[PDB]
Amino acid sequence: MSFKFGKNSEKQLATVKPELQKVARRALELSPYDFTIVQGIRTVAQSAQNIANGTSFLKDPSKSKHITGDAIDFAPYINGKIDWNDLEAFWAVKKAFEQAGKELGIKLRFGADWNASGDYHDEIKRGTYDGGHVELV
Ligand SMILES: [Ca+2]
Ligand SMILES: [Zn+2]
Domain boundaries, the chain: 1-137
The candidate with the shortest Cα–Cα distance to 101, out of 29, 37, 41, 34, is: 29
- Please answer whether residues 111 and 64 qualify as being in contact, where contact means their C-beta atoms are separated by less than 8 angstroms: no
Ligand closest to CA 94: 1
Ligand closest to CA 117: 1
Ligand 2 centre to CA of 70 (Å) is 10
First CA to last CA distance, the chain:
29
Cα angle 97, 100, 106; round to 5: 105
Ligand closest to CA 115: 1
Ligand 2 centre to CA of 124 (Å) is 14
